Every structure is written in structure tokens, then in C-alpha cells.
Amino acid sequence: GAMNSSNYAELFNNDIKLFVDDTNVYRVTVHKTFEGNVATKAINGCIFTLNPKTGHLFLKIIHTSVWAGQKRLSQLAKWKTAEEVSALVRSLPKEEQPKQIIVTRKAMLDPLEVHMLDFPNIAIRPTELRLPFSAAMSIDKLSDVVMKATEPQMVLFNIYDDWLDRISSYTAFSRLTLLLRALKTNEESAKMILLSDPTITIKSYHLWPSFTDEQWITIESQMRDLILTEYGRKYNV
């Protein structure tokens, strides 16, 4: 069944697995109508499908056209997520197909299961971890590709840049979840920390700045401080 801290090293073994996060699939701005009622306007979303071992991100951009004349959109978002992940699996050669897919939210268990009935050797697993993958749209270059998309489109990223050249997946994932947890708790502060030194740039083929091992330690320290400050604020403690 479920995935917790007890079986955390599993994520970096040699079974192909994917995380699916559906939290940015269906995004709305809420506004007032002229008659003074409330209406939503959908904006482009994305499915966050990630291989935690390799850092390969399968970013399926959800164009707002997929919602046109559809009812119960938040329920459809789950089934549209399930359908797109199923399609990605089917487009992958056999030896690239995952043996497991971990959904970050339980409401995805049945939709993914029903879309994957042809793949009974693929385990569909929930997780008890609270993973900050919702903050994926606080990453400038993912936000950019999603907001510019004029159509359905699949864009492949490596969310670890070239980190694996120097560190383990375990360590890469921790760095990632720390950056995303920071970005989710205080986007402004988080991003100030990342770019305040103009001499450390983002390579064109990268998502994050080109930090030395030393400069990562410092950055990682600053993100841990920011996460406690905000928690001390949240809870007056």
C-alpha cells in the first residue's frame, strides 16, 4: 500500500517509479461578475510526473481548452491526470515503463487505477509524505512554459539539472524537497535567497543556479532558516 519515512530509500533503488502530482492540473482565478456574483477563469495547468532517481520530469501542460463545456472540473482534473499518465506509460518503451506510480494525493488512486487496468504489473501507491510538489509553478522556467502554451504540449526537464554528476538521488531529492518546501512557505523570501548574488546564474539548459558544493550548503542552510522562521510565525512559537 502506502509510502512513508520507513520505506524512503525505496525511491532511489533501481525499480523505475514515477511520482504524480495533480495539484496544478486545474488552476482558477476567482473574480466578481458585473452582476456582482462570483465566477472562475481557468489558467493553463500541468501534471507533475517525476522520476525521483533520475530527476526526469514529464511536464504535461494542461491548456484551458480541455475544460471548455465540461462540468465538475475538479473531478475531471483527476481523470484527465489519470488519462495523461496512462498515455505517457503507453508511449514509453517496455523497459522504460515504471513498476510503480506514487500519487501525492489519495483522490488520484481510483482514477489512475482504472486508466491503468491494462498494466496490472504496475503498483499504484499513495504516500503519507506531505511533498511540496505544488510549488513547482514557483520555478520560473516551468511557470513560463505553462503560461505561454497555446495548446496541449509535453515538455521534458531534468529537475536536478546536473546535480547527479556530484551527489546521490537521495541527496538530490532532499535538496529539491527543501527548495520546494521553502518556495511554498514563502515564495518571495525563497527566490530572494536563490538569486540575490547576480554572479551565480542559471544555465540556459537548467532550472536552478550553478552553485558550487560550498554555495549549496549556504543556500540549503538559508532555506532551513526560512522554513523555521515562517513556522515560528504561523504558530507563535
Binding site: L76, W79, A82, E83, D110, P111, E113, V114, H115, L117, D118
Partner: protein, 300 residues
């Protein structure tokens, strides 16, 4: 009016005949049940005073032969047997009556309860679910498992109920994953009614037989089947009006007949709450919704 005689009652036992039950003491001179209404399936069932574990019994129809019970002291149970010699069987029966060694099937003239619980149940369909095709009667107990239970082990002694699985390729048309999963009309109406059962009557026969096996033997597996067959109709947006009207009637008499004290184990909180309050037919089961609320408001 037909009769199921007993050679003897060598062990102390509680005997069920349909929804009736009689205590018989060890070696009490008991020689069977007379005045059994012709026209319906019947079940005769047993729970030994000394092992309340293993309820068991026999589905039969007196139109299909002359049946009697004999205690087998090797296998340790009351066994149903056919008497092919008809003149021997009338001679046996007429004696025991004259000697009045027989309880009378105790039907109140106004009481339609049995008809209402067995309205679509037919011995020919019971014998395809319980395969032992050298007998005209079917044996069931507490522990017999279902074909589906075995999937998730002895095939000969299984209950071969129609497998229903909401997360199966049978249930879900490729390309209609969401439509078919939230509205099970194609699973109910094309796959099951047109496809497998042919008509509503055989669907209801199996549902009713599963309930009775749940109630009389506490067969966990029949319980799951009874609930699955209810959920599949309740979770279908598109059901013939007459099936809904007949379902409400079926469920009403099943809920009415349930022992008050067994609603903790025989009724599945989730299925009923969905059927009565959440599903497409939430408003289609007035009679069942009223008796459930007045008799089991706790469960909901």
C-alpha cells in the same frame, strides 16, 4: 403440500425450514416437516447444539423429487437424500403423519414473506451456483467461499456467483474509464443484464439467493455478493423503472426479515449510505429507505 421426512434426530440440533426454526433434543422422536408449500424453493438448515460453528443446509424444490434427511454419524451432519422408490416414500411419510412425529411448516395464511424473499429464485439457477449435479438439491454452509474470493481454494465446494468487480476491464470500456466508473449503466445493462444474466429476473434471483445464504449461514462471501449486486444498480444512472420498483420491494422484505441483532455483520455501512443518500437511485428506494431509517438509523 409436500413433506421432507427424517429417519431420526440422533444429535441435539436447531432445525431451520425457510424463516422458521425448531429446537430438537438428542434422540427426541422427530420425523420431519410436513405441509411444505409447493411452488417455491425451500432451505432446510442445521446448527448443532454442541458446535454453533458450521451452520449448513439444503436448497430444494419438492416438485423435483422425494427428499428426506438422514444423520450420517461418519461425516457428522444431517444429510439430504433422494428416495427414487416413490411407493416406499409415501409409505414412510403416511406412517409418521398418522403417528404425528412431524412439525407442520407454520405458514400464517396472510404471510407472503417467503414468496417475497424467493420471488426470482429458481432451483435450476441455484444448481449452477452450487455445482454437485448428481443431486437435485444444493448444500451450503458458513465457510463455503466464492469463485471471486478464491481469485483474491477448493473449486468443487465453491459458491460460483457471477463475479462483479467495479475496477475490472469487464466493468470499464477502454476510452470511457471515467464515464463507466462513475455511471455503471453499461456494466449493469449491457455486460450483466443483456450479456450474462439475459433478464432482470435472473439478476434478482442471484441477489436474493446471496442474501438468504448470508442470513441463514452467515456466509461472508454471499454477503459481499448481495451488496455488490445492490451497488451496481444504485451506481447506474440508467435503470428500467420496473427494476427499481422491484429492487425497492426485494430490499424491503430482506431488511424487514433480517434478525435485528445481525445488522452489525450482515449490513455494510458504506454500501447502504451510498445507495440511499449519494447514488443515482438515492430517491428510487422509498420503501427500503423508510424501513432502513426506522429499524437501523444507527448504521446510517
Amino acid at each position: 403440500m409436500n413433506t421432507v421426512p427424517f429417519t431420526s434426530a440422533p444429535i441435539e440440533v436447531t432445525i431451520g425450514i425457510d424463516q422458521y426454526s425448531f429446537n430438537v433434543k438428542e434422540n427426541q422422536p422427530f420425523h420431519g416437516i410436513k405441509d411444505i408449500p409447493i411452488g417455491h424453493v425451500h432451505v432446510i438448515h442445521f446448527q448443532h447444539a454442541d458446535n454453533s460453528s458450521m451452520r449448513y443446509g439444503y436448497w430444494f424444490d419438492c416438485r423435483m423429487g422425494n427428499f428426506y434427511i438422514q444423520y450420517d454419524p461418519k461425516d457428522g451432519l444431517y444429510k439430504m437424500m433422494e428416495e427414487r422408490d416413490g411407493a416406499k416414500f409415501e409409505n414412510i411419510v403416511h406412517n409418521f403423519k398418522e403417528r404425528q412425529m412431524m412439525v407442520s411448516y407454520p405458514k400464517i395464511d396472510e404471510d407472503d414473506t417467503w414468496y417475497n424473499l424467493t420471488e426470482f429464485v429458481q432451483m435450476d439457477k441455484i444448481r449452477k451456483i452450487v455445482r454437485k449435479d448428481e443431486n437435485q438439491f444444493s448444500y451450503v454452509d458458513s465457510s463455503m467461499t466464492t469463485v471471486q474470493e478464491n481469485e483474491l481454494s477448493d473449486p468443487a465446494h465453491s459458491l460460483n456467483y457471477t463475479v462483479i468487480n467495479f475496477k475490472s476491464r469487464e466493468a470499464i470500456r477502454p476510452g470511457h474509464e471515467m464515464e463507466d466508473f462513475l455511471d455503471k449503466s453499461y456494466y449493469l445493462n449491457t455486460v450483466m443484464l443483456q450479456g450474462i444474466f439475459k433478464n432482470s429476473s435472473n439478476y434478482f434471483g442471484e441477489l436474493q439467493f446471496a442474501f438468504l445464504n448470508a442470513m441463514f449461514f452467515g456466509n461472508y462471501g454471499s454477503s459481499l455478493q448481495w451488496h455488490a449486486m445492490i451497488e451496481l444498480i444504485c451506481s447506474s444512472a440508467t435503470v428500467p423503472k420496473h427494476m427499481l420498483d422491484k429492487l425497492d420491494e426485494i430490499l424491503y422484505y430482506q431488511i424487514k426479515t433480517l434478525p435485528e441483532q445481525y445488522s452489525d455483520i450482515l449490513l455494510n455501512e458504506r454500501v447502504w449510505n451510498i445507495c440511499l443518500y449519494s447514488s443515482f437511485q438515492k430517491n428510487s428506494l422509498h420503501n427500503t429507505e423508510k424501513i432502513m431509517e426506522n429499524k437501523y438509523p444507527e448504521l446510517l
